[PDB]
Design a protein around this ligand. Structure first.
Ligand SMILES: O=C(CO)[C@@H](O)[C@@H](O)[C@H](O)CO
Ligand SMILES: [Cl-]
Ligand SMILES: [Cl-]
Length: 909
């Protein structure tokens, strides 16, 4: 029966108009125009908000069917149901009680997009233009008792202030340039002496709580007030005199008992109550907020929380919410995201060029997540920062709004201006920005911007260099250019700095689109891009491979993230990393770089428990120089641990096992070591495993268990050391000797020299071992163009080559010494022995191995070069042996007949 009589909830039906003349429709708030079905239909000439790097949609004939009216499908991001970028008017009648007359009145709008102007009965009151903070209007003396008509004019266009066309606060890459009001919307009444805002400053070691409160005195004379502050059983009361207007009082509170600190492993929170009581009127205004005791500091060039060494395992949030476009303002929505993040072993979230609503901070407070917030800007491409533009003052005002609203949350641990800044005066601007904030508020750590610039005044550094795949690196990266290994780290680069460093947007490994998730898009955003990819896949006769492409490419994607994350954990005294990402990025051409979809939900190729094995607060790490051995070699490696738990791990023993796929233990041992303290690169022991007893070509799993934490790695062991040119002819060209053998009915193995495959037959496909980087649209075709392999292990051609249906490290040699053959240009019904998964933008049937029948003879075609450096390629010799034993065997009968001249497309002069 209790009610909130001091507020008037404004959520409901508003009279709507896009020209302030036609008021024939009604809109529902909270919500956008798009979430209400209002706006214009998506057309080719839609004035989007964000860059489009690959413009093939507008010009190439393959997108012609998607440029016609009635079938507009856009490939570069999720497509909203409607679009509108301009002024919109919202109107609603309210009834102000008599008891509100002459009192403190204010309007609260949690999220507008973008600029809002308030009118009371046609009289303009003021303007608000916050992107990542609420809109507030002081209505004291401006709103009398009785019926009144509130009107809002919300403008979502980019005008004087361009924060960056790709900023996730406005851009159609993720959140979309919506128009409306979202979140809590209410009128609030307060006594003539009230609390406007509170800055909470807990002192962990001093056992104190300091508060700088902004008090309001609506009287025209001085006011005698009583100020009571309560934190649990501790109370401090204070009587002072308030001058007319705003007042800045500062109070302290001593904590008698022990203080429970806030961190990843124990997110303890305290309740603060601050009340002000006017002595004349007896009216009391009460303010309440949660807070936590924690100190995130840089001690001796290393990140610490509460004097404990800290390591950040983070992922990005780019305001992706396809159900609504605009962000959710409930705690449960964010509780889900933080929960699945922690389920994958993460403790950190970076918000890319936008600030989330209050619920994201409150959820992270109880979860113990470390948040890094940015000020709604990616000042590049379209604009610039630090050159005297209107953006310069906006970022200052936006950061002050963000710290005033959310600065008391313990999860607010780091802050930057935004992402990847541009501007000749941006270094100077960001230097003043970081320096001033470090002086204003020491409750958090500050960095200039994400990715760059490294300023000496930064608390920590954000750098993109310490990662596997750099922009433009392509096939020259470690994962692609060198044989598999797990003994590399970034310790050399980060050793050049006296500041802690956090990786910037690591991973970016792609998966094939998951068409099953298309049913989840029942809201504002529709996956029309997925509809294009799915249609072209079917047009190339591969509609039945959609789920296999998802699972096979996802197994390879998860392998790449494991490699990137373990490389960061092997870097001594690394500050941390920020994944891009755990979830998908639906924009910038379609950057499917996550093991979770745009809804932070699972896809089905890696379980969070398996992700948590290599990405966790305590992770065993194995350093091996290679992963391909013979029965005459000895596995020589080292075992270490990256332990960043709440306390040292009281374990003096590590147990390792080398087991087969069936579970049989080939080797095992126990490593003795001292108790594990907080840090990484902590040695556990050395491994020296002879492999003479390993029979047959085998894939072995090396698992290491430290206490409750276990991690595993794969190695492949082959024999140390089926051919007679009469029976099997292997050649690089279909010459006279090869064509004669096929006329005679013999068997021929065609192995193409690497680089000899002409562009017509698939030479244009730059094949590599890793997954695609970001996406070939945004990168304008950076290598690789492939997404792993797809094969049937039960195929007799692979009987001597251990493998699953998906790509793994033993396939690095195949992907690195080959070209992908476009088999449709030979015969459209050709079934590959080992298929290559092509980029989803092209959906070309690709193959590394296939077989055809040329007359009476049988031909096995291989895009893999089985010629060069075969003494160093142990895994290539094994695959070649498996093929030769198959061809000389009983079950080599190619059914697809083809002519000799049809195969001439594999050669050029
Ligand atoms: O450099 C990067 C990495 O953030 C790209 O986002 C840009 O180069 C875009 O291609 C600019 O359009
Ligand atoms: Cl031979
Ligand atoms: Cl054909």
């Amino acid at each position: 029966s209790n009610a909130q009589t001091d507020k008037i909830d404004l959520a409901g039906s508003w009279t709507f108009s896009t020209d302030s003349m036609d008021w024939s429709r009604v809109i529902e708030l909270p919500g956008s125009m798009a979430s209400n079905g209002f706006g214009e239909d998506i057309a080719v000439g839609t004035d989007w908000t964000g860059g489009i790097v690959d413009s093939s949609y507008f010009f190439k004939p393959s997108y012609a069917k998607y440029r016609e009216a009635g079938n507009i499908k856009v490939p570069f991001w999720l497509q909203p149901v409607k679009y509108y970028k301009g002024k919109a008017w919202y109107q609603k009648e309210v009834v102000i009680p008599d008891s509100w007359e002459g009192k403190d009145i204010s309007l609260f709008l949690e999220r507008c997009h973008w600029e809002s102007r308030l009118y009371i009965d046609g009289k303009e009151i003021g303007m608000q233009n916050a992107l990542g903070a609420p809109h507030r209007y002081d209505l004291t003396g401006k709103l009398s008792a009785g019926k009144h008509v509130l009107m809002l004019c919300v403008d979502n266009r980019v005008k004087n202030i361009d924060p960056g066309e790709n900023s996730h606060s406005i851009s159609d890459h993720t959140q979309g340039n919506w128009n409306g009001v979202v979140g809590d919307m209410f009128l609030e009444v307060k006594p003539e002496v009230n609390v406007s805002s509170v800055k909470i400053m807990p002192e962990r070691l001093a056992k104190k709580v300091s508060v700088s409160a902004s008090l309001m005195n609506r009287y025209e004379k001085d006011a005698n007030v009583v100020l009571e502050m309560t934190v649990g059983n501790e109370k401090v009361q204070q009587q002072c005199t308030l001058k007319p207007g705003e007042n800045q009082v500062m109070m302290s509170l001593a904590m008698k008992g022990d203080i429970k600190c806030w961190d990843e492993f124990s997110p303890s929170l305290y309740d603060l109550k601050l009340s002000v009581k006017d002595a004349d009127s007896g009216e009391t205004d009460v303010y309440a907020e949660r807070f936590g005791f924690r100190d995130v500091k840089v001690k001796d060039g290393k990140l610490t929380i509460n004097d404990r060494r800290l390591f950040l395992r983070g992922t990005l949030d780019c305001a992706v919410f396809p159900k609504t476009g605009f962000p959710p303002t409930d705690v449960e929505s964010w509780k889900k995201i933080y929960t699945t993040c922690r389920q994958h072993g993460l403790n950190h979230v970076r918000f890319h060029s936008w600030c989330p609503p209050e619920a994201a901070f409150a959820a992270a407070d109880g979860m113990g997540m470390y948040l890094e917030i940015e000020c709604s800007s990616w000042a590049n491409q379209s604009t610039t920062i630090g050159d005297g533009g209107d953006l310069d003052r906006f970022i200052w005002e936006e950061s002050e709004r963000i710290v005033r609203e959310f600065g008391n949350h313990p999860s607010f641990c780091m802050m930057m201006y935004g992402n990847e800044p541009a501007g000749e005066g941006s270094n100077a601007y960001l230097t003043n920005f970081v320096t001033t904030w470090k002086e204003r508020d020491a409750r958090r750590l500050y960095c200039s911007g994400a990715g760059w610039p490294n300023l000496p005044v930064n608390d920590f550094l954000s750098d993109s260099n310490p990662r596997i795949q750099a922009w433009g690196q392509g096939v020259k990266s470690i994962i692609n250019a060198q044989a598999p290994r797990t003994d590399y780290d970034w310790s050399e680069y980060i050793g050049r700095f006296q500041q802690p460093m956090v990786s910037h947007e690591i991973g970016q490994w792609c998966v094939y689109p998951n068409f099953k998730e298309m049913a989840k898009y029942d809201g504002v955003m529709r996956p029309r891009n997925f509809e294009i990819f799915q249609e072209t896949l079917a047009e190339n006769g591969m509609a039945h491979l959609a789920d296999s492409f998802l699972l096979a490419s996802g197994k390879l994607q998860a392998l790449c993230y494991k490699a990137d994350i373990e490389a960061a954990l092997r870097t001594k005294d690394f500050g941390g990393f920020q994944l891009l990402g755990l979830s998908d990025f639906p924009g910038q051409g379609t950057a499917l770089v996550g093991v979770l979809d745009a809804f932070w939900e699972e896809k089905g190729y890696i379980r969070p428990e398996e992700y948590r094995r290599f990405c966790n607060s305590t992770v065993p790490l194995l350093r091996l120089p290679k992963l391909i051995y013979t029965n005459q070699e000895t596995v020589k490696g080292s075992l270490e641990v990256a332990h960043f738990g709440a306390a040292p791990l009281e374990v003096t023993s590590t147990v390792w096992t080398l087991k087969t796929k069936e579970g049989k233990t080939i080797a095992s041992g126990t490593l003795a070591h001292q108790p594990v303290g907080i840090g990484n690169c902590i040695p556990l022991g050395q491994l020296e495993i002879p492999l003479d007893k390993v029979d047959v070509p085998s894939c072995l799993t090396l698992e290491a268990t430290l206490g409750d934490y276990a991690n595993s790695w794969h190695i492949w062991v082959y024999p140390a050391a089926v051919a007679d040119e009469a029976q099997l002819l292997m050649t690089d060209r279909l010459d006279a000797k090869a064509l004669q053998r096929l006329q005679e009915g013999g068997n021929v193995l065609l192995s193409l020299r690497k680089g000899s495959l002409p562009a017509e037959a698939g030479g244009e496909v730059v094949i590599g071992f890793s997954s695609i980087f970001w996406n070939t649209a945004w990168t304008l075709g950076q290598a690789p163009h492939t997404l792993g392999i797809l094969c049937n292990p039960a195929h007799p051609a692979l009987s001597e080559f251990p493998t699953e249906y998906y790509s793994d490290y033993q396939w690095w040699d195949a992907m690195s010494h080959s070209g992908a053959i476009e088999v449709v240009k030979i015969d459209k019904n050709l079934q590959p022995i080992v298929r290559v998964i092509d980029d989803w933008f092209t959906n070309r049937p690709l193959a590394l191995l296939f077989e055809v029948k040329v007359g009476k003879g049988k031909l096995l075609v291989s895009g893999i070069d089985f010629w060069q450096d075969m003494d160093k390629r142990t895994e290539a010799r094994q695959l070649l042996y498996s093929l030769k034993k198959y061809m000389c065997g009983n079950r080599f009968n190619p059914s697809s007949e083809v002519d000799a001249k049809d195969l001439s497309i594999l050669f050029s002069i």
